[PDB]
């Protein structure tokens, strides 16, 4: 089968401006395993991004955690760009600090 990916962008700790935190872009429930993930700072591919072990859940769909260390400002915009076989064009998700 082929499954579209589910993207969530959040912070490891509450997004206190001016302190150091971790941005996680968690992609889950996709199939097959090949996926393109870029964290983005104002539209810029963040090169210092580490990913977790490509795993799968009980429903045989794969999941991945991309993360980066960061310090939030009151003016910056973080997003997560994903491309998968199921996506025509790469989807983008902005990080609402509420999450």
């Amino acid at each position: 089968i082929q499954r579209t990916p589910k993207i969530q962008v959040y912070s490891r700790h509450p997004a206190e401006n001016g302190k150091s935190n971790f941005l996680n872009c968690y992609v889950s429930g996709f199939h097959p395993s090949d996926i393109e993930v870029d964290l983005l700072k104002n539209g810029e591919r963040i090169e210092k991004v580490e990913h977790s072990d490509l795993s799968f859940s009980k429903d045989w769909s794969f999941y991945l955690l991309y993360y980066t260390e960061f310090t939030p400002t009151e003016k910056d915009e973080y997003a997560c760009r994903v491309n998968h076989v199921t996506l025509s064009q790469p989807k983008i998700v902005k990080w609402d600090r509420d999450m």
Binding site: N24, S28, P32, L54, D98
Partner: protein, 263 residues
């Protein structure tokens, strides 16, 4: 608790992508990791600290080398045209009286198509590919007995050993840092977002309360953290201006009494 091996082989991996990789899990905690490139089973996260003997990790690596072989063999018996994604879920869960219950499922292109039947000592399945792969694996020397030991002795002993060596790793209790926030996304209807930020174990419940009364539970989202911890968030859409009279209730194991969060 349960020890599970998440095995994945792809018939056409990307360049620099291992065509085989494994992730081992003790409950919801990643401890083992393998792939075809490095070819060695290395501990993960906070399992590099447990007092495991030195050969333990080599013995694991030898087991996973046998499995790497088998999984790569299957694509051969497949026939047809590629690509393929062969998956395997191998493990054992310690039942109440040291009675390990094994698990041995396999999914081809994401469709559960095969099992290992202990009653018959062989890989079973009725999908055509299930038959092909199962016959091929059945003819690969002692692969039947290798898997039989991997499920009936190797896995349960590893579990009991890891449990004694991992008691602390398993009794990790990190209570969540909560942050109830408000978002005016919908016109005339502001959505309230409750967020538990770094916690372990992953069992956490989020309720919403309306003026001290039970208002429900929002849309729930759940995920891991870069430290192996977990993150949780709930969203509830309420009428604009009633947000002040709303509270979020979190029931986590690391909180001895359920916590109450305000705006």
């Amino acid at each position: 608790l349960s020890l599970l091996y998440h095995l994945t082989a792809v018939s056409s991996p990307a360049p620099g992508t291992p065509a085989f990789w494994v992730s081992g899990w003790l409950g919801p905690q990643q401890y083992l990791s393998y792939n075809s490139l490095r070819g060695e089973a290395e501990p993960c996260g906070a399992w590099v600290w447990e007092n495991q003997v030195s050969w333990y990790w080599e013995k694991e690596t030898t087991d996973l080398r046998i499995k790497e072989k088998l999984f790569l063999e299957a694509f051969k018996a497949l026939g047809g045209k590629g690509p393929y994604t062969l998956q395997g879920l191998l493990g054992c869960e310690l039942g109440p009286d040291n009675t390990s219950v094994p698990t041995a499922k396999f999914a081809l292109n994401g469709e559960e198509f095969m099992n290992f039947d202990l009653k018959q000592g062989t890989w079973g399945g009725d999908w055509p590919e299930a038959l092909a792969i199962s016959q091929r694996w059945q003819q690969q020397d002692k692969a039947a007995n290798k898997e039989l030991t991997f499920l009936l002795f190797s896995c349960p002993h590893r579990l009991r050993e890891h449990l004694e060596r991992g008691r602390g790793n398993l009794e990790w209790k990190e209570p969540p840092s909560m942050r109830l926030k408000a978002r005016p996304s919908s016109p005339g209807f502001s959505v309230l977002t409750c967020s538990a930020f770094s916690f372990y174990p992953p069992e956490l419940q989020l309720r919403f309360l309306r003026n001290g009364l039970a208002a429900g539970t929002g849309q729930g989202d759940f995920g891991p953290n870069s430290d192996g911890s977990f993150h949780a968030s709930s969203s509830l859409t309420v009428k604009s201006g009633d947000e002040h009279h709303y509270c979020c209730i979190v029931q986590h194991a690391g909180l001895a009494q359920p916590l109450r969060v305000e705006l």
